[PDB]
Design an enzyme around this catalytic site. Structure first.
Site, PDB file in Angstrom:
ATOM      1  N   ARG A  98      -1.131   3.284   7.553  1.00 43.86           N
ATOM      2  CA  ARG A  98      -0.572   1.799   7.312  1.00 43.86           C
ATOM      3  C   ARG A  98      -0.511   1.364   8.904  1.00 43.86           C
ATOM      4  NH1 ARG A  98       1.577   0.506   2.251  1.00 43.86           N
ATOM      5  NH2 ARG A  98       0.590   2.007   0.701  1.00 43.86           N
TER       6      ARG A  98
ATOM      7  N   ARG B 282      10.856  -4.741   6.231  1.00 46.78           N
ATOM      8  CA  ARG B 282      11.679  -3.367   6.368  1.00 46.78           C
ATOM      9  C   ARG B 282      11.952  -2.947   7.794  1.00 46.78           C
ATOM     10  NH1 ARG B 282       6.737   0.193   3.818  1.00 46.78           N
ATOM     11  NH2 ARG B 282       8.430   1.815   4.253  1.00 46.78           N
TER      12      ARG B 282
ATOM     13  N   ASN C 122      -1.434   8.640   4.550  1.00 45.42           N
ATOM     14  CA  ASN C 122      -1.164   7.381   3.876  1.00 45.42           C
ATOM     15  C   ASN C 122      -1.140   6.315   5.376  1.00 45.42           C
ATOM     16  OD1 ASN C 122      -0.719   5.011   2.473  1.00 45.42           O
ATOM     17  ND2 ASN C 122       1.151   5.560   1.940  1.00 45.42           N
TER      18      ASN C 122
ATOM     19  N   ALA D  18      -2.235   4.523  -7.240  1.00 45.86           N
ATOM     20  CA  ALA D  18      -3.280   5.617  -7.485  1.00 45.86           C
ATOM     21  C   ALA D  18      -3.196   6.764  -6.533  1.00 45.86           C
ATOM     22  CB  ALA D  18      -4.776   5.040  -7.436  1.00 45.86           C
ATOM     23  N   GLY D  19      -3.089   6.771  -5.534  1.00 46.97           N
ATOM     24  CA  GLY D  19      -2.981   7.806  -4.461  1.00 46.97           C
ATOM     25  C   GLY D  19      -1.790   8.488  -4.760  1.00 46.97           C
ATOM     26  N   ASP D  20      -0.434   7.696  -4.980  1.00 48.37           N
ATOM     27  CA  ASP D  20       0.810   8.321  -5.051  1.00 48.37           C
ATOM     28  C   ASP D  20       0.854   9.347  -6.319  1.00 48.37           C
ATOM     29  OD1 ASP D  20       1.664   7.057  -2.808  1.00 48.37           O
ATOM     30  OD2 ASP D  20       2.319   5.251  -3.809  1.00 48.37           O
TER      31      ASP D  20
HETATM   32 CL   LIG Z   1      -0.874  -1.664   7.232  1.00 48.97          CL
HETATM   33 CL   LIG Z   2       3.995   1.773  -0.613  1.00 52.33          CL
END
Ligand SMILES: [Cl-]
Ligand SMILES: [Cl-]
Ligand SMILES: [Cl-]
Ligand SMILES: [Cl-]
Ligand SMILES: [Cl-]
Ligand SMILES: [Cl-]
Lengths: 310, 311
Positions: B179, B115, B177, B268-270
């Site tokens: 990451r 990405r 979120n 699940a979070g989304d």
């Molecule tokens: Cl990550």
């Molecule tokens: Cl994602």
């Protein structure tokens, strides 16, 4: 896994060809709607795959870099299953491989790619590893994609290793394979391709792909351009037209029989190169090798996908 | 395509939620060995997908950027098929979308993603397009992945647009979120996440994902951290454990009922976030919204894939 044969100080039991470049993960249309099959491709890997099928008794090695994730391990396993020696692959933690996705809609194929951060772009990070891979190869093969994916330091490292191997008797073979989208600039592209030419004994340019960038009036001009860089055997692919060659001042042409029922031209050039190099290693005259190359390429054009079982 | 309803100067016929972020192409193992099924996912898109099913009579808009190739066209078509309004999507010629691949290794899921050059990274390149997408949204939702993929100028532009929308009455919701691999450094990550918090009315952190990175001693510490940045309603997810919240100085807990059989916790979070925002949009009290969020999340955990069809 892959049989590497035996050796003494002087000879190896198998003819040995090393291909250097990027193997790409590839998702290609499957049957069941909306689904894709994972396989592996990429120009220089395609050439290695064809070579391993043409001479399964020989040692066909691939040098590149991959990640340490599951997909990279699948790539390594696929090389072994295809009879390709991946013992020299380098592992770059924290990176993964590059990817092609092919889509098929109403019978038309197009592709997308993701490769700007692939592990393979680090394949020239270790000069000693490059040298060791080349040391006892009869032929070392690389492409303009191999050059494109490297930064300038990596390009220089690879070119130096090739020159050094050439000087010890390694036969160096080069597929210029110009892909403008992989280069950050036009001048860099054309100059770097010709740096590749300058370390190569055999060059396999394509007239259609290169004429615009270099101003070649015709295939003989293409051949002259490579000979001026020191290339001893130039074999100019030109689609369905006769293959022009130039070897030590001598020109010739080899006709290409027409190919009916075109299905997919993917890897036509990669397979031509494999057919040529297979025949050259077998000690056949250049003209015979060119005919064999054209014959294989025609069957690949008649088949679907990068890796056609001919 | 997707019904967008009608409007006058003052009201729209549909309640309007805008989700901003990156939708990813996704391939997951299919029935035959070595084959994979193509679909679309990505955190903020998943949330939009669940919202469109929860309130199919509302307008659920997705703002992002895609390319002009076949995969981008399939992504746009999938959004429309899911009842998501992609009318505001930007098209960036010569680029494609981001992709992730799920493979199996001794039966266990492994993820690879690509990405670094996706079109979505340009989603904040046009300030006016951003502002226009937000202008009549009842809620604007974004995530820490939305922030991570942008450059400094893009982050500034987005945060600026979010703050201006907030000031005109739009409700801003944020899922942090975290990451780490998507960030150039942990310093840039934590600081930028808290910049996101500073423009948000609602924050939906996960204790499990954030605790070690921010040094949170517990979910209440997580909540305090967002409240200090001005978040009015902080709802802290913590796996199967009670959901702690903090709203205008008042704390509470909402039980999460055990899940029969955990099949796949993807999204699940989304989905929790979708359930929460759906209920908030319907004017339900926060505790009620949290129960609804936990109930949907529980069903997603019991289902396979990012997009679980829950009635
Ligand atoms: Cl990550
Ligand atoms: Cl994602
Ligand atoms: Cl010996
Ligand atoms: Cl190209
Ligand atoms: Cl370049
Ligand atoms: Cl000869």
């Amino acid at each position: 896994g892959v049989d590497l044969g035996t050796e003494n100080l002087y000879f190896q039991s198998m003819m040995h060809i090393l291909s250097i470049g990027e193997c790409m993960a590839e998702l290609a249309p499957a049957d069941l709607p909306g689904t894709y099959r994972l396989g592996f491709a990429g120009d220089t890997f395609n050439t290695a795959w064809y070579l391993a099928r043409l001479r399964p008794e020989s040692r066909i090695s691939y040098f590149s870099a991959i990640g340490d994730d599951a997909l990279s391990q699948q790539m390594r396993a696929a090389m072994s299953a295809a009879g390709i020696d991946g013992g020299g692959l380098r592992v770059i933690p924290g990176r993964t491989v590059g990817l092609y996705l092919i889509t098929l809609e109403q019978g038309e194929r197009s592709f997308a790619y993701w490769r700007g951060q692939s592990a393979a772009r680090e394949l020239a990070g270790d000069a000693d590893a490059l040298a060791a891979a080349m040391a006892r190869a009869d032929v070392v093969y690389f492409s303009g994609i191999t050059l494109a994916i490297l930064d300038q330091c990596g390009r220089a490292t690879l070119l130096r290793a090739l020159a050094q191997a050439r000087a010890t008797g390694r036969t160096i073979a080069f597929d210029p394979n110009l892909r403008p989208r992989l280069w950050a600039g036009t001048g860099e592209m054309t100059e770097t391709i010709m740096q590749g030419a300058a370390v190569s004994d055999i060059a396999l340019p394509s007239f259609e792909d290169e004429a615009a960038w270099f101003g070649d009036a015709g295939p003989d001009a293409t051949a002259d351009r490579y000979a001026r860089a020191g290339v001893r055997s130039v074999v100019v692919k030109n689609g369905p037209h006769a293959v022009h060659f130039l070897q030590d001042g001598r020109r010739g042409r080899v006709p290409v029989p027409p190919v009916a029922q075109v299905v997919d031209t993917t890897a036509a050039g990669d397979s031509f190169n494999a057919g040529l190099l297979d025949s050259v290693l077998a000690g056949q005259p250049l003209e015979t090798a060119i005919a064999a190359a054209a014959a294989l390429a025609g069957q690949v054009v008649q088949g679907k996908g990068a890796l056609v079982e001919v």
